[PDB]
Design a protein around this ligand. Structure first.
Ligand SMILES: Nc1ncnc2c1ncn2[C@@H]1O[C@H](COP(=O)(O)OP(=O)(O)O)[C@@H](O)[C@H]1O
Ligand SMILES: [K+]
Ligand SMILES: [Mg+2]
Length: 829
């Protein structure tokens, strides 16, 4: 739909009836199709078909058949308890989904790509979707194009970053009148857009683990049901008793709300993270951040502050006595609303008497090449009152000399002093900037170096120290030379193994064997003189060795690296494209925020893992107890008691998402074989405890075994199962022994209340025909505590360079060699 779907001259050319700057009277627009068309607003706030949706399903059908086959509404004892359990599961699921969907949207709101349109006044900006179609737009150097459309008549070329919706990853340089694609970035440019198709033709991992776990649990429940049905067939049980058995085992076996409570834990953790100034794009980024082993962070803005200190410019040069300040400030963009960190320090340190007032007047800029990362060099051409074209150049100290090597070519008197001074200021931890000037058509003097300095953030050193205890390995990425990077590493205690990116082999190699360039990249404390492509190459290499890499991105240059990284982190002050391509967007600066978010994500993952182990352990426990007891002895717990056991497993679990869970000291990952081993062993231990409990009463009579004065088997088993099952959470939510960390008051209270309810059940026996002695419950508590201790001890006991053989090194060498020979041949002699 182009012409008949909301597009013609009056939303196209009537846009361009005013000047560039101005817009008035969004009049009667007749249609606001802007808010992610029919995606979030699709069937708005139904809020009642989610409730009934939880009442329909495989297990819910089994429960409905159970509640119907209880002689209908004859008596409110079996029907009442079964419908109560079904209602409780439905309500808990609905509340959890509501909480998880009402808090992931609050993170979406605080991260929407706000869009700027300039009207008569200095209009701030327009919130993303509520912008009228057929309206002007200002896409400015790394902003996600809010609305699809075409360019405005003004002449300028913007390099739109594509391959998000198209194929080519290179410069897709639409110039004038072409189709500008929405939800795409702009690498560089300054153009205006006319809106067309404002919402038309816009062309995790824990969930899969949960799905697999649920499938295996279903398999286990089916196996148990098969045992029960076979053993009932051999005994010719009436169909009603078989149905009661299968209902009990269906209730205990399949966890109704495992993925729901896992998503609730993720959502609560994401909300807590966003409270800590760390907004998560996709809910799956929590696990990815918890799993990262290497954090490749840019030095500027993360490991150090963006404000620079200037210390005595090196004005020791030839004829040029003081021109450093004047010519360097000549190359200032002076916008004061889009200038970078480098530009500010020149203006703040312009306390120069002779000509600093007269140097900013009449020096009209003709050409201003922006700072190119591949060149590390800003070049400006301006006018002067003398009439000359002073082409200022400013960049890395060596690159300025590489620029001035043509005229006045490398005199030994000045070049040696220049290199010695830049090395000296590297030793002093000073960022240096060189400047060269062009008076005439054949003059090229070298002015000198400018010793800027940006100190590390006051919390950076201890943050890096603690990051080594967390299992991370921080790899700094500097565009600076090797000397400055190495001195910064010495200052930060980051270790001094800094390799120049181009020399090492990131990209076009230097005939370094491929098996060892990967080894150097893996064991490297940093990378100096890094270009945008080297970031992606570093991420690609580090993942081959088997790591999970977290990249600190900022700006549109490192968007592909952010996408390729397992956890792309958009640091403070990033552009719209950088945070759109990242996984976690930060609203606080420094590495301290990143490390705090890492610790929080590890805590959230610990909560998730502890709950999963809890759920499947008690599932295995209670299924291999009840199924075995039915098979061997044609007996099972009273249906009301087993329903209440299931309920108690949905009360002590709506609190796991809110507790003081500790964080692992090493990167944490889904070790599914170890998870299943631990859970099967815990369930087997619990089942052995329960079987001991019941075989005591077989051995010494109904009221003579684990019970002392009087009791009944069913309520005693109820109490033992409830205690040993709910107390299992205290050992899964710990690092080592269960007494290491103190559980939160909420979890402890919710579990102690359930324990009190189970004890009252046993003492007064209000679902069976007899009560239990007050000393029998004491003995059951003692035995359950012993089982808890042995189970926790089992859980605690089992809780705990070239990275390649000949095959791996050969493979990496072959990969790098084939890349190099492809380049070599492609050169075609
Ligand atoms: N705006 C600028 N004008 C001139 N030189 C610059 C500018 N920004 C950075 N440089 C120089 O380029 C080199 C590193 O630039 P960069 O790659 O930007 O460091 P970072 O990537 O850590 O911001 C250093 O020599 C620095 O002084
Ligand atoms: K990613
Ligand atoms: Mg940087």
């Amino acid at each position: 739909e182009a012409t008949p779907g909301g597009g013609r001259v009056v939303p196209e050319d009537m846009l361009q009836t005013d000047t560039r700057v101005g817009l008035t009277s969004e009049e009667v627009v007749q249609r606001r199709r802007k808010y992610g068309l029919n995606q979030m607003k699709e069937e708005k706030e139904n809020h009642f078909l989610k409730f009934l949706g939880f009442f329909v399903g495989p297990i819910q059908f089994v429960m409905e058949g159970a509640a119907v086959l209880a002689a209908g509404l004859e008596d409110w004892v079996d029907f009442g308890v079964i419908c109560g359990l079904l209602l409780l599961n439905a309500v808990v699921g609905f509340v959890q989904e509501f909480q998880a969907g009402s808090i992931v949207d609050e993170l979406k709101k605080t991260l929407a790509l706000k869009a700027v349109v300039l009207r008569d006044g200095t209009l701030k900006e327009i919130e993303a979707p509520e912008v009228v179609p057929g309206d002007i737009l200002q896409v400015e150097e790394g902003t996600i194009i809010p609305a699809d459309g075409r360019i405005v008549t003004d002449d300028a070329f913007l390099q739109v970053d594509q391959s998000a919706l198209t194929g080519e990853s290179l410069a897709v340089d639409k110039h004038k009148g072409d189709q500008v694609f929405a939800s795409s970035a702009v690498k560089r440019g300054e153009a205006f857009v006319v809106i067309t198709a404002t919402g038309d033709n816009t062309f995790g991992h824990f969930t899969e683990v949960l799905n697999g776990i649920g499938t295996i649990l279903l398999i286990l429940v089916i196996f148990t049901l098969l045992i029960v049905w076979v053993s009932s067939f051999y005994r010719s049980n009436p169909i009603v008793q078989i149905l009661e058995f299968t209902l009990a085992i269906t209730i205990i076996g399949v966890p109704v709300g495992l993925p729901a409570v896992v998503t609730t834990t993720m959502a609560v953790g994401a909300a807590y993270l966003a409270k800590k100034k760390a907004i998560v794009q996709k809910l799956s980024a929590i696990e990815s951040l918890a799993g990262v082993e290497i954090l490749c962070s840019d030095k500027t803005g993360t490991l150090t502050k963006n404000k620079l200190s200037l210390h005595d410019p090196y004005t020791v040069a030839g004829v040029d006595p003081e021109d450093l300040m004047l010519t360097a400030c000549l190359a200032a963009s002076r916008k004061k609303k889009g200038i970078d960190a480098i530009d500010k320090a020149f203006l703040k340190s312009l306390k120069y008497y002779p000509r600093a007032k007269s140097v900013l007047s009449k020096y009209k800029v003709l050409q201003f090449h922006p700072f190119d990362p591949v060149s590390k060099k800003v070049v400006a051409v301006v006018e002067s009152p003398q009439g000359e074209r002073i082409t200022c150049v400013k960049g890395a100290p060596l690159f300025v000399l590489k620029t001035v090597e043509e005229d006045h070519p490398i005199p030994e008197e000045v070049d040696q002093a220049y290199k010695n001074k830049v090395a000296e200021f590297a030793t002093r931890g000073f960022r240096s900037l060189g400047v060269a000037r062009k008076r005439g058509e054949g003059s090229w003097e070298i002015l000198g170096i400018m010793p800027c300095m940006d100190p590390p953030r006051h919390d950076t050193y201890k943050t890096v120290c603690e990051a080594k205890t967390l299992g991370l390995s921080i790899k700094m990425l500097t565009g600076d030379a090797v000397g400055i990077a190495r001195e910064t590493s010495r200052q930060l205690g980051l270790g001094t193994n800094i390799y120049n990116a181009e020399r090492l082999g990131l990209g076009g190699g230097g005939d370094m064997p491929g098996s060892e360039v990967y080894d150097f990249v893996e064991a490297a404390d940093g990378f100096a003189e890094v270009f945008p492509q080297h970031k992606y190459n570093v991420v690609e290499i580090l993942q081959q060795r088997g790591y999970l890499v977290a990249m600190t991105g900022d700006g549109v240059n490192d968007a592909p690296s952010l996408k390729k990284a397992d956890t792309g982190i958009a640091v403070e002050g990033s552009s719209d494209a950088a945070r759109s391509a990242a996984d976690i967007v930060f609203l606080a600066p420094g590495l301290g925020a990143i490390i705090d978010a890492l610790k929080t994500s590890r805590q959230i993952f610990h909560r998730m893992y502890a709950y999963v182990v809890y759920r499947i352990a008690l599932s295995i426990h209670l299924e291999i107890f009840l199924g075995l007891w039915i098979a061997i002895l044609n007996r099972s717990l009273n249906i009301e008691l087993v329903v209440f056991i299931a309920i108690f497993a949905d009360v002590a679990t709506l609190a796991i998402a809110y507790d003081n869970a500790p964080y692992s000291q090493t990167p944490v990952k889904w070790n599914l074989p170890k998870l299943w081993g631990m859970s099967v062993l815990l369930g087997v231990v619990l089942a052995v405890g329960t079987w001991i409990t019941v075989t005591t009463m077989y051995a010494q009579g109904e009221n003579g075994g684990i019970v002392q004065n009087f009791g009944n088997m069913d309520e005693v088993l109820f109490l033992q199962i409830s205690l040993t099952e709910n107390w299992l959470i205290f050992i899964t939510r710990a690092n080592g022994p269960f007494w290491s960390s103190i559980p939160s008051w909420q979890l402890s209270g919710a579990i102690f209340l359930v324990d009190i309810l189970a004890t009252c059940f046993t003492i007064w026996g209000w679902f069976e025909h007899s009560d239990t002695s007050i000393v029998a419950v004491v003995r059951i508590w003692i035995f359950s505590f012993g089982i808890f201790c042995i189970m926790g001890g089992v859980y605690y006991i089992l809780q705990d360079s070239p990275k390649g053989n000949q095959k791996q090194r050969s493979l990496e060498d072959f990969v790098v060699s084939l890349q190099r020979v492809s380049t070599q041949h492609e050169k075609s002699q």
